DNA sequence: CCTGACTCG
DNA sequence: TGCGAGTCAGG
């Protein structure tokens, strides 16, 4: 733990080498419009700390950041790229991202800072971010010499760790996954996050006003039916009303008490009408709390845009997630909630929203590898069965007899015996190897799969059945986004990606480009990979996200 | 902060 | 006793 570096007062030529480890430090978890608090550069010529005020106003440094021929190794280059966009600076030339490298090597390690990645290779000449900045109300940027040393140590670690990580990825056949898929995707997600999605706040606020009135009415109806006021949003208080006051059957308990889950309340409808009202209330209350109030809280007022963060190194299957706000769980399944999407509008006048979704991509992937309310329920049966639902679960979902449920499942595998063999085989392989893989060589380790405990082992077995299929579908749409943006640029279209929702891409564009997108977007998505079955994509466009159906 | 609710693929 | 996610109010 003894490391020389220069705390620089100005940028010099030797800091602008054609290969460097670069650290552009943003301390806040949400990096949109967040302060850059320090910069570090490590290259052949040495180690350097720079003050942001200095470096980011220096024309040669800004030029270097933006020069794609000056290669930078980083950790979480998307965080830096976006933070720099908010500072009006383009970052190009990122050739290695240690966060994504660590994630591919083992998504279970949950690597979220350089220190945690460093530990994978017994590197310890660097501290955890939390140890440096502290947490919660105590979180603060430390004294410059302490900050400077930390950033340098992080850069130095990225510098030394690149080779060992690349070598391990190659040994796993994951080097191309990193360099040709995840890393190019990171720059594309950076663009999407910075672009944001415009919100119609006038419409959203009016929806909220009307929703409050409706909640009040439903609320009073429930109190009338129950014969008492109580907090409906407390499962504990609700349980007392349902199972003690009204004396309804107790169908399920959890560790804290009586279950009031939606599945349970639906099953209680033959006993008391109040349960349907409560389900409605809890639906409405989530709309109001999360998709009206919560969404308005994160709208940037001057532009009316919301800027999500797509976490690229979180899920265990290779999917993305979306936070603050989550734009991947906006309501669509019931018309009442679906109307929320009318509030998501194009960012320019005379533009339109365009949405394209793969149809049953996971089921097509499985076929390749293995060789309205009714239809909504039928989807859960299809995915449920292939992913290992039991007769109990299926019976409970269709409210049918366990005997009947067992016959459906038997008959299902009768129709698709190759799916059956595959699921048996993939489980045995996971037990032998200790991991499963996707089409593009993404990996998930499953060390619980030989467990002597039934529950623990069974969960791992079902991960073996599910992760390769869900993860392959993730691999595919990731490749489609890369291929799609290349085509957009090639044709000089103004259209651009706004969102990915697992098997869906959401774009905005001038109305004039709608005809071209109707051909281009589905073509690119369908051709991202060639399976033994065709990939099918549906697409629609309209004045709001709601109308793009 | 955890649990159980509602939300999506 | 299908799987992958995030946010919220209540306690
Ligand atoms: N993608 C996916 N969806 C699941 C899973 N489990 C339940 N579902 C539900 C929620 C979303 C829905 C998926 O829709 P699909 O793409 O399979 O079918 P679709 O015919 O294309 O949908 P649509 O009615 O819009 O045309 O099924 C799962 O493991 N993966």
CATH no. for residue A403? Answer: 1.10.150.20
CA distances from A110 to A45, A102, A115, A131 (A): 33, 9, 12, 17
Q: Hey, which bits of A176-330 come out as E strands?
A: 197-199, 253-254, 257-258, 305-306, 309-311, 321-323
Q: Concatenate the DSSP letters of all residues of A51-109 into one string.
A: -HHHHTT-HHHHHHHT-TTSEEEESSHHHHHHHHHHTT-----EEEEHHHHHHHH-GGG
Which positions 491-510 on chain A have a beta carbon less than 7 angstroms from any atom of strand B?
A: 501-504
Q: Indicate the residue among A473, A508, A539 that finishes a domain.
A: A473
A252 sits within 7 Å of strand B by its CB: no
- As a whole number of angstroms, the distance between CA A431 and CA A446 comes to 8
CATH code for the domain in which residue A290 is found? 1.20.1060.10
- As a whole number of angstroms, the distance between CA A508 and CA A428 comes to 45
Claim to verify: residue A376 and residue A318 sit in the same structural domain: no
Residues closing a segment before a gap in chain A (C–N exceeding 2.5 Å)? 371
Nearest residue (CA) to C1' of C3: A466
Claim to verify: residue A208 and residue A63 sit in the same structural domain: no
| CA of A288: nucleotide with nearest C1' | C8
Distance of C1' in B6 from CA in A6, Å:
53
The experimental resolution of this structure, in angstroms, equals 1.6
Ligand 1 midpoint to CA A361 (Å): 9
Residue A419: how many CB atoms within 10 A of its CB?
20
Range of the domain at A223: 197-306
Which positions 416-445 on chain A have a beta carbon less than 7 angstroms from any atom of strand B?
A: none
**Tally of structural domains, chain A:** 4
Q: Answer yes or no: are the C-beta atoms of A139 and A27 closer than 8 Å.
A: yes
Claim to verify: residue A323 and residue A292 sit in the same structural domain: no
Q: Indicate the residue among A436, A456, A473 that finishes a domain.
A: A473
Ligand 1 midpoint to CA A503 (Å): 9
DSSP state of A36: P
- As a whole number of angstroms, the distance between CA A40 and CA A31 comes to 18
Claim to verify: residue A345 and residue A371 sit in the same structural domain: no
Distance of C1' in C9 from CA in A343, Å:
24
User: Which of A373, A383, A548 most suits a substitution to test ligand 1, by most atoms within 8 Å of the C-beta?
Assistant: A383
Buried b (16+ CB within 10 A) or exposed e, A5-21: bbebeebeeebbbebbb
Question: A454-490 and A361-370 helices cross at what angle (nearest 10)?
Answer: 110
Distance of C1' in B4 from CA in A262, Å:
11
Task: Give residue for tokens 């899920």.
Answer: A315
Q: Answer yes or no: are the C-beta atoms of A292 and A204 closer than 8 Å.
A: yes
Claim to verify: residue A352 and residue A443 sit in the same structural domain: no
Give the ligand 1 atom nearest the CA of A536.
21
Ligand 1 midpoint to CA A530 (Å): 21
| DSSP-based three-state secondary structure for A176 | helix
Q: Answer yes or no: are the C-beta atoms of A39 and A17 closer than 8 Å.
A: no
Q: Which residues share a beta bridge with A50?
A: A39
| CA of A396: nucleotide with nearest C1' | C1
Q: Answer yes or no: are the C-beta atoms of A467 and A316 closer than 8 Å.
A: yes
Distance of C1' in C2 from CA in A89, Å:
46
**Cα–Cα–Cα angle for A211, A213, A218, nearest 5°?**
90
- As a whole number of angstroms, the distance between CA A191 and CA A186 comes to 9
Method: X-ray
Distance of C1' in B9 from CA in A502, Å:
6
Contacts of A324 (CB under 8 A, 6+ apart): A30, A298, A308, A309
Q: How many residues does chain A have?
A: 549
Claim to verify: residue A466 and residue A514 sit in the same structural domain: no
Nearest residue (CA) to C1' of C7: A290
Element (H, E) at A437: strand A435-437
Claim to verify: residue A164 and residue A203 sit in the same structural domain: no
Give the ligand 1 atom nearest the CA of A380.
7
| DSSP-based three-state secondary structure for A215 | helix
Q: Whose CA is nearest to atom 18 of ligand 1?
A: A360
Claim to verify: residue A437 and residue A349 sit in the same structural domain: no
Q: Whose CA is nearest to atom 28 of ligand 1?
A: A383
Q: Indicate the residue among A163, A196, A229 that finishes a domain.
A: A196
Enumerate residues lining ligand 1, CB below 6 A: A 359-360, 362, 379-380, 383, 503
Claim to verify: residue A148 and residue A170 sit in the same structural domain: yes
Distance of C1' in C2 from CA in A470, Å:
13
Claim to verify: residue A3 and residue A95 sit in the same structural domain: yes
Q: Which one, of A407, A288, A364, lies nearest residue A528 by Cα?
A: A364
| DSSP-based three-state secondary structure for A519 | helix
Claim to verify: residue A176 and residue A300 sit in the same structural domain: no
Claim to verify: residue A339 and residue A483 sit in the same structural domain: yes
| Residue A126: alpha-carbon gap to chain centroid | 28
Ligand 1 midpoint to CA A522 (Å): 18
Q: Concatenate the DSSP letters of all residues of A152-174 into one string.
A: HHHHHHHHHHHHHHHHHHHHTT-
Q: Whose CA is nearest to atom 8 of ligand 1?
A: A380
CB-count burial class (<10 Å; 0-12, 13-18, 19+) for A530: exposed
Ligand 1 midpoint to CA A382 (Å): 9
End-to-end CA distance of chain A: 59
- As a whole number of angstroms, the distance between CA A96 and CA A186 comes to 11
Distance of C1' in B5 from CA in A91, Å:
42
Q: Concatenate the DSSP letters of all residues of A196-214 into one string.
A: -EEE-HHHHHHHHHHHHHH
Ligand 1 midpoint to CA A358 (Å): 9
CATH code for the domain in which residue A320 is found? 3.30.70.370
């Amino acid at each position: 733990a003894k490391m020389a570096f220069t705390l620089a007062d100005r940028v010099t030529e030797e800091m602008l080498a054609d290969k460097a480890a670069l650290v552009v430090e943003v301390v806040e978890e949400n990096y949109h419009d967040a302060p850059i608090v320090g910069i570090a550069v490590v290259n052949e010529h040495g180690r350097f700390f720079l003050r942001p005020e200095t470096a980011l106003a220096d024309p040669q440094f800004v030029a270097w950041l933006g020069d794609e021929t000056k290669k930078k190794s980083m950790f979480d280059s998307k965080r830096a790229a976006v933070a720099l966009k908010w500072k009006g600076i383009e970052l190009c030339g990122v050739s290695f991202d240690l966060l994504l490298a660590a994630y591919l090597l083992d998504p279970a390690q949950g690597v979220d800072d350089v220190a945690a990645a460093a530990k994978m290779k017994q590197y310890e000449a660097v501290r955890p971010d939390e140890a440096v900045y502290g947490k919660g109300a105590k979180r603060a940027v430390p004294d410059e010499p302490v900050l400077a040393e930390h950033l340098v140590r992080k850069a130095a670690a990225i510098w030394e760790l690149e080779r060992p990580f690349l070598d391990e990825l190659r040994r796993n056949e994951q080097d191309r996954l990193l360099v040709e898929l995840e890393q190019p995707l990171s720059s594309i997600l950076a663009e999407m996050e910075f672009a944001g999605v415009k919100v119609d706040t006038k419409r959203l606020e009016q929806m909220g006003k009307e929703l409050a009135e409706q909640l009040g009415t439903v609320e009073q109806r429930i109190y009338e039916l129950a014969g008492q006021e109580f907090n409906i949003n407390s499962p504990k208080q609700l349980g007392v009303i349902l199972f003690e006051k009204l004396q309804l059957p107790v169908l399920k308990k959890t560790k804290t008490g009586y279950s009031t889950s939606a599945d349970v309340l639906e099953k209680l409808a033959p006993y008391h009408e109040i349960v349907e009202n409560i389900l409605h209330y809890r639906q409405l209350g989530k709309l109001q709390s999360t998709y009206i109030e919560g969404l308005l809280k994160v709208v940037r007022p001057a532009t009316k845009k919301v800027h999500t963060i797509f976490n690229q190194a979180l899920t265990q299957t290779g999917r993305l997630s979306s936070t603050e706000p989550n734009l991947q769980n906006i309501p669509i399944r019931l018309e009442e909630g679906r109307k929320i999407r009318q509030a998501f509008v194009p960012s320019e006048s005379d533009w339109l929203i365009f949405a394209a979704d793969y149809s049953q991509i996971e089921l097509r992937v499985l076929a390749h590898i293995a060789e309205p309310n009714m239809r909504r329920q039928a989807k859960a049966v299809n995915y449920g069965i292939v992913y290992g639902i039991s007769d109990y679960g299926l019976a409970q979902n269709l409210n049918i007899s366990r005997k009947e449920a067992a016959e459906f499942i038997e008959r299902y595998f009768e129709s698709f015996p190759g799916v059956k063999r595959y699921m048996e085989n993939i489980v045995q392989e996971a037990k032998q190897k200790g991991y499963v893989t996707t089409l593009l060589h993404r990996r998930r380790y499953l060390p619980d799969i030989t467990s002597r405990n039934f529950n623990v082992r069974s969960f791992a077995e079902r991960m073996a059945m599910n992760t390769p299929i869900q993860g392959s579908a993730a691999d595919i749409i990731k490749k489609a986004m890369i291929d799609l943006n290349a085509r957009l640029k090639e044709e000089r279209l103004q259209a651009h990606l706004l969102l990915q929702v697992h098997d869906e891409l959401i774009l905005e564009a001038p109305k004039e480009e709608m005809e071209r997108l109707c051909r281009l977007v589905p073509e690119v998505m369908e051709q991202a990979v060639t399976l033994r079955v065709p990939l099918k994509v549906d697409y629609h466009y309209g004045s709001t996200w709601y109308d793009a159906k």
